[PDB]
Design a protein around this ligand. Structure first.
Ligand SMILES: OC[C@H]1O[C@@](CO)(O[C@H]2O[C@H](CO)[C@@H](O)[C@H](O)[C@H]2O)[C@@H](O)[C@@H]1O
Ligand SMILES: OC[C@H]1O[C@@](CO)(O[C@H]2O[C@H](CO)[C@@H](O)[C@H](O)[C@H]2O)[C@@H](O)[C@@H]1O
Ligand SMILES: OC[C@H]1O[C@@](CO)(O[C@H]2O[C@H](CO)[C@@H](O)[C@H](O)[C@H]2O)[C@@H](O)[C@@H]1O
Ligand SMILES: OC[C@H]1O[C@@](CO)(O[C@H]2O[C@H](CO)[C@@H](O)[C@H](O)[C@H]2O)[C@@H](O)[C@@H]1O
Ligand SMILES: OC[C@H]1O[C@@](CO)(O[C@H]2O[C@H](CO)[C@@H](O)[C@H](O)[C@H]2O)[C@@H](O)[C@@H]1O
Ligand SMILES: OC[C@H]1O[C@@](CO)(O[C@H]2O[C@H](CO)[C@@H](O)[C@H](O)[C@H]2O)[C@@H](O)[C@@H]1O
Ligand SMILES: OC[C@H]1O[C@@](CO)(O[C@H]2O[C@H](CO)[C@@H](O)[C@H](O)[C@H]2O)[C@@H](O)[C@@H]1O
Ligand SMILES: OC[C@H]1O[C@@](CO)(O[C@H]2O[C@H](CO)[C@@H](O)[C@H](O)[C@H]2O)[C@@H](O)[C@@H]1O
Ligand SMILES: OC[C@H]1O[C@@](CO)(O[C@H]2O[C@H](CO)[C@@H](O)[C@H](O)[C@H]2O)[C@@H](O)[C@@H]1O
Ligand SMILES: OC[C@H]1O[C@@](CO)(O[C@H]2O[C@H](CO)[C@@H](O)[C@H](O)[C@H]2O)[C@@H](O)[C@@H]1O
Ligand SMILES: OC[C@H]1O[C@@](CO)(O[C@H]2O[C@H](CO)[C@@H](O)[C@H](O)[C@H]2O)[C@@H](O)[C@@H]1O
Ligand SMILES: OC[C@H]1O[C@@](CO)(O[C@H]2O[C@H](CO)[C@@H](O)[C@H](O)[C@H]2O)[C@@H](O)[C@@H]1O
Ligand SMILES: O=N[O-]
Ligand SMILES: O=N[O-]
Ligand SMILES: O=N[O-]
Ligand SMILES: O=N[O-]
Ligand SMILES: O=N[O-]
Ligand SMILES: O=N[O-]
Ligand SMILES: [Cu+2]
Ligand SMILES: [Cu+2]
Ligand SMILES: [Cu+2]
Ligand SMILES: [Cu+2]
Ligand SMILES: [Cu+2]
Ligand SMILES: [Cu+2]
Lengths: 338, 338, 338
């Protein structure tokens, strides 16, 4: 019945994003994606704590899918027989059937194909949602990602001027609820099923043990810092499927920010810190003006520094002393100061 | 002194709303409302947990009051002699005297009549506020509701186009703090006064035991699902008097959302999840495009699934396979897949 | 190299703000500020609880700095040798070097001079950020304040109309994490260093023991209520360096609110409650219409009433019975009521 060109997309692992056009003169296509569920033990902090994760495509977050308004998105979801649980997928970008969850429940050893029309522009969360208490558990176990539906003319500033990014990164933030024993040590389990009862107890108190970007504390620091150059306009897509976050680029700003994540709304300009509602994605554009290290954090600094929620950007270029300079280096306080 | 027509309104129990006009060519009226305080033990979850509630008109939330900009709202507040505590009322829509709380403190066996002018458009919280620590306690015991002050021309999209709703529902969300004994069982009390000290201890740790719509887990599910039809524009008013919420219609969107709740501001369009600041009301308009069950949640899914914060809509009509379709039902993974 | 007029500003203690012009026809200046770090034990609640605070200029929050777009801000930061820790400063208003933190780390007995260009308008947080876990600890110990960068034409309503305030107050909100002993009593320490390990344990559970304005419960109540008059337009700048807040003026409104705090964005109008993202400052303008006491709160009323987060305004003038009146004082319920 639906007679449009089909285009297969190969997803990549976050924080990177598969190749795509911003502005396009192509008409609507059927864009074909495949997601494979993988349950696996994963390391989530710098002390080697593990937890029984559940993922789309082996990553937390799941990969970013990018399409244009008016495209049809055909998703094959696969639940390999090595998995232990049923899984499904709910797209916040889609209309009907609980975002697709009501049409996509699959047992281990099965797959399903859903098609949804990309009628609403923005960045949107997708996540597993098998039913009842399984919904939060699968989501906080890692089964969430995002999709971006671009306008066919690309981004704009809401005042008739085009915006183009030079680079795009997807930062998925994950709240984790890892059980502890009587002494406070984190517990380990042999399967997700075995972890469930103790994990649900931690979840009920609504306080995460870890808050991480790209699936672990320190994931996007050190050698996995995000690269940019002075003068580049960088789009940072940020998602949180379950809990609020307050992104902040330390030493920078959000030049254009869609904090509710929807491109039919004009962006706010010149933000210090923005707000991603739990259950949503948002996006910020920034043009780097200064080289050096930048930390990208949630600006609950306890979470950022102590629970794992810090990424770095390493930005190459020349320092602009007009914007900022050290006028006098650290020196002894003058004895004749009052 | 004030010589305007008087009109008596009969309130109804949430989630329904008393009859009202959207656009009106009537001039300013004195709109007369009565609220009666009722302290009573209420069931708040599906396991039969009870708590010592304090309510306006016997419901959590209190009823939605609807008037138009420029009306005068005359509220008789009654505190029957069967109650044990003093109560009052503070309208966020009103100007002066702590929103009216400073003029409305009544002991059991008394009543009071306050009049306030509806000078500001939007949806607004009202709540009890007797003074000091009694303020949070009365509010989290259930003494809060909302009022909607419509523009006389009805809603608009902020770009000169009228918006009209076919149906309106009021979803009041309540954070509850129910004490537990040493084993974790919820405690019961014979009066609000007796519950106070233990409840205040739970409140101080800022983590609710329950988060409910319309006064109990499951209130708006099953046979009390909210009804709609494909093609109907539905206004959902959401209030939270004490704690933030992040509403999400699973399988739908917010077509037009006033998340800060004030109709002098243009709505945002096409939201996945919106944000109700604690101490405020907001409103979202959505036109249903697909039949079936929709869950309306706060998108902290722990709260939604495990603490009680899920409502359902049951939507009648014909499925649109253009928007979404199951291309292939669950099937065994092809043996010749890689 | 930089050849502009220099102007020394003398800071004052919050909630007051140093003298400044709103609209200015002066060109860019080098505005010179000095901040001195002071570590000291401070009283933070009405029962006399103390904690080991770390402050800019001996106050929580640090003082508000006010400049205009295009000015250069030259800050001398001094860390006296009576202090025990290294400190620095990060300006959310500045571009590069982690907002200045990377250029300003000073040991006790040292000072440093940083210059940053005020290229972005709004109110912005500044805070200490020495590195790693020291970042949240210094911030929640009190080392944070705000800066306001005004447009050279002053504020506007985003629709081409000037806004002018008659009075300005800076309300800094501080989340504190005070350790308790086994019985629940707050612990005291002889130095910040000694308090660290126990404080970090409380911080990890993300629930504050106190939430205060101007450094202590009750700071801005009683005789330190904030003064205004009927008819005055008052700007309230609110900052929170670490945790979300939801400001509300009880009995009033936000006439014009920049909740993300940035004057390049038009304000929202007629708000009941607004939202300050942790890591940001926001600002609300209100014209008082009624005399009397107003409470300014975060509208988590538990925090407001029980954890310390209430300020008062005392507003002089004549009552307007058109806006609000008590039609009938408290009276016995009529025996012939149903
Ligand atoms: O012996 C505990 C010690 O070993 C580490 C090493 O990285 O990890 C083990 O213990 C953790 C807590 O049970 C587990 O999460 C992990 O799976 C296991 O290898 C340390 O993290 C831990 O303190
Ligand atoms: O708005 C984008 C997109 O949403 C649709 C429904 O799929 O329209 C919705 O929003 C419209 C614009 O706000 C409303 O007028 C309409 O009633 C609502 O269904 C699409 O038609 C539109 O392209
Ligand atoms: O947090 C309580 C308590 O537990 C201990 C081990 O008994 O540390 C655990 O908690 C720390 C904070 O989350 C982790 O850094 C560590 O991996 C974990 O074992 C104590 O060290 C701590 O007091
Ligand atoms: O890219 C930052 C990196 O460059 C160096 C010199 O190679 O210094 C530049 O950046 C400093 C601020 O971070 C400026 O103060 C300095 O003048 C400028 O040359 C390194 O110091 C710095 O880490
Ligand atoms: O015996 C406890 C058991 O009975 C239930 C039945 O619905 O409710 C009782 O106990 C609760 C906890 O004290 C009370 O809240 C309630 O008022 C009382 O009827 C169960 O909820 C409970 O587990
Ligand atoms: O804005 C609606 C309504 O509020 C009032 C006061 O009751 O005006 C306030 O807001 C005006 C528009 O923003 C301000 O210009 C005014 O100064 C402020 O008091 C009403 O007059 C107005 O209808
Ligand atoms: O939550 C702690 C602990 O308490 C028990 C009974 O001892 O269950 C209580 O808590 C549950 C979660 O809130 C409720 O579902 C139940 O109504 C309540 O009695 C244990 O079952 C649980 O481990
Ligand atoms: O109203 C939803 C209800 O209708 C049924 C058939 O009566 O199916 C419709 O909705 C499905 C998606 O929820 C579509 O896939 C199907 O093709 C459509 O006919 C029921 O299955 C469904 O629960
Ligand atoms: O003896 C405890 C009692 O004294 C008070 C008096 O104001 O304060 C003391 O104890 C507190 C808890 O250790 C300290 O924070 C404070 O520094 C010390 O003077 C009361 O607050 C306290 O209950
Ligand atoms: O926007 C205020 C201020 O920011 C600067 C950079 O210091 O410009 C940023 O924002 C501009 C307007 O949104 C962008 O076009 C620009 O690319 C970005 O660097 C200043 O130039 C401007 O005055
Ligand atoms: O909060 C637990 C418990 O501790 C006690 C003293 O043992 O009070 C402490 O906590 C109160 C709440 O924060 C404070 O008001 C007081 O300053 C502090 O000592 C008990 O009174 C209370 O049950
Ligand atoms: O400024 C408030 C203060 O004024 C008094 C009389 O001096 O009353 C005025 O304010 C009341 C509402 O708070 C009005 O109902 C009253 O009519 C008006 O005169 C005091 O009662 C009040 O505290
Ligand atoms: O389907 N989940 O356990
Ligand atoms: O300025 N960043 O914490
Ligand atoms: O007036 N309340 O307890
Ligand atoms: O998509 N709702 O959780
Ligand atoms: O530098 N701070 O401990
Ligand atoms: O209306 N203030 O809580
Ligand atoms: Cu799953
Ligand atoms: Cu969802
Ligand atoms: Cu009450
Ligand atoms: Cu209130
Ligand atoms: Cu410091
Ligand atoms: Cu910061």
């Amino acid at each position: 019945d639906l007679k449009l060109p089909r285009q297969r997309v190969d997803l990549v692992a976050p924080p990177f994003v598969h190749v795509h056009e911003q502005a396009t003169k192509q008409g609507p296509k059927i864009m074909e994606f495949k997601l494979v569920v993988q349950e696996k033990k994963m390391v989530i902090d710098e002390k080697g704590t593990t937890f029984q994760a559940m993922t789309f495509n082996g990553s937390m977050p799941g990969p970013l899918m990018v399409v244009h308004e008016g495209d049809y998105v055909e998703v094959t979801l696969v639940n390999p027989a090595t998995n232990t649980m049923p899984h499904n997928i709910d797209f916040h970008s889609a209309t009907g059937a609980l975002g697709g969850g009501a049409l996509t429940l699959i047992n281990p050893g099965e797959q399903v194909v859903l098609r949804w029309k990309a009628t609403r522009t923005g960045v949107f969360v997708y996540h597993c949602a098998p039913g009842g208490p399984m919904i939060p558990w699968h989501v906080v176990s890692g089964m969430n990602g995002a999709v971006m539906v671009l306008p066919r003319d690309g981004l704009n500033d809401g005042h008739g001027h085009s915006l183009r990014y030079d680079r795009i990164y997807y930062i998925g933030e994950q709240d984790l609820y890892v059980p502890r024993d009587e002494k406070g040590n984190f517990k380990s389990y042999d399967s997700p099923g075995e972890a469930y009862s103790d994990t649900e107890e931690v979840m009920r108190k609504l306080t995460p043990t870890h808050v991480v970007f790209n699936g672990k504390a320190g994931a996007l620091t050190g050698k996995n810092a995000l690269n940019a150059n002075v003068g580049e306009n960088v789009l940072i897509v940020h998602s949180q499927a379950n809990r609020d976050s307050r992104p902040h680029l330390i030493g920078g700003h959000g030049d254009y920010v869609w904090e509710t994540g929807k491109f039919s709304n004009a962006p706010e300009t010149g933000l210090e810190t923005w707000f991603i509602r739990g259950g949503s994605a948002g996006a910020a554009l920034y043009k780097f003006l200064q080289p050096g290290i930048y930390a990208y954090v949630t600006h609950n600094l306890i979470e950022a520094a102590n629970l794992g929620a810090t990424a770095h950007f390493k930005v190459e270029g020349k320092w602009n002393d007009d914007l900022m300079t050290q006028v006098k280096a650290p020196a002894d306080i003058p004895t004749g100061s009052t």
